[PDB]
Amino acid sequence: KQYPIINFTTAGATVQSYTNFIRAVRGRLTTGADVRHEIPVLPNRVGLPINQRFILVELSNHAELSVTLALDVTNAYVVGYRAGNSAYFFHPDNQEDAEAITHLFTDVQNRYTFAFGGNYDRLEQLAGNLRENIELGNGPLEEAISALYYYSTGGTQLPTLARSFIICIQMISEAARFQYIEGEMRTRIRYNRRSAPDPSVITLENSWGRLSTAIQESNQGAFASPIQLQRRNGSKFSVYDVSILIPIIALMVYRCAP
Ligand SMILES: Nc1nc2nc(C(=O)NCc3ccco3)cnc2c(=O)[nH]1
Numbered sequence: 001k002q003y004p005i006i007n008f009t010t011a012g013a014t015v016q017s018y019t020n021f022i023r024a025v026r027g028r029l030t031t032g033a034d035v036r037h038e039i040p041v042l043p044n045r046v047g048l049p050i051n052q053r054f055i056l057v058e059l060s061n062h063a064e065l066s067v068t069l070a071l072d073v074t075n076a077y078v079v080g081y082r083a084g085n086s087a088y089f090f091h092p093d094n095q096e097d098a099e100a101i102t103h104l105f106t107d108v109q110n111r112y113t114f115a116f117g118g119n120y121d122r123l124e125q126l127a128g129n130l131r132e133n134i135e136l137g138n139g140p141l142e143e144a145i146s147a148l149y150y151y152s153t154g155g156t157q158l159p160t161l162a163r164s165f166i167i168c169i170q171m172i173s174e175a176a177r178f179q180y181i182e183g184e185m186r187t188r189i190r191y192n193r194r195s196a197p198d199p200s201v202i203t204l205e206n207s208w209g210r211l212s213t214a215i216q217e218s219n220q221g222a223f224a225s226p227i228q229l230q231r232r233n234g235s236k237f238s239v240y241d242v243s244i245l246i247p248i249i250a251l252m253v254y255r256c257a258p
Helices: 015-029 095-103 120-127 138-150 158-177 179-190 199-206 208-216
Strands: 005-009 054-060 066-072 078-083 086-089 110-113 222-230 236-241
Touching (some): 066 158, 138 158, 199 208, 199 222, 208 222
Parallel strands (some): 005 054
């Protein structure tokens, strides 16, 4: 017995198989017994035992390649992955984090830490493309699984590896964080399209920590100051209250209760 594993395959994927997956991911990220204003909070990192810190997400595609992402339950971040006999980790932000990841993928023959960190800014630079120009859907996802798998063999240039991370992160972590983003992926899957996320998706992604804070500091759901988001067409609008976000955000990073 070792960290909980959730499986998804792109082979034959449907909106139901993808929804089932994202639902199970959420269920492993949190027990759900800390909820504020109806929105679940992930476990506080302060004092969480290592043995509860991570979840694994096994990704397969029609080429029958498989990779396994490791996600930090405290924030749903993808911290690294394993493909066959190697495992690779983003460069950690602190020594505590560096220490935690020593506990993942312990039986793998080859382990490495990238010199670069895993935030979108760094990955975009590495990919040489912005999330607004990187396509999402089942096609991109199956392609990103192969790219990640092939990375040890030397088959995959770094820019492509970084694009593939940006895809996985959005289709897995962001979809888990936001029902809105899950729905965005369901739509691409339903119509078998691939398309870049629009400003509504990108600004929600960028605002996740800020939303977690606003809702958690709110006066019974009313934000202490407004949060600006973006519509599909890039126009700015303001959110004042948690009520509107209940069908949009599914999970928040822990902040202490005011
Ligand atoms: N590896 C990884 N990287 C991630 N990077 C981001 C990301 O940059 N967010 C933008 C941001 C705004 C403020 C601070 O930061 C989000 N999720 C993830 C994530 O879930 N896994």
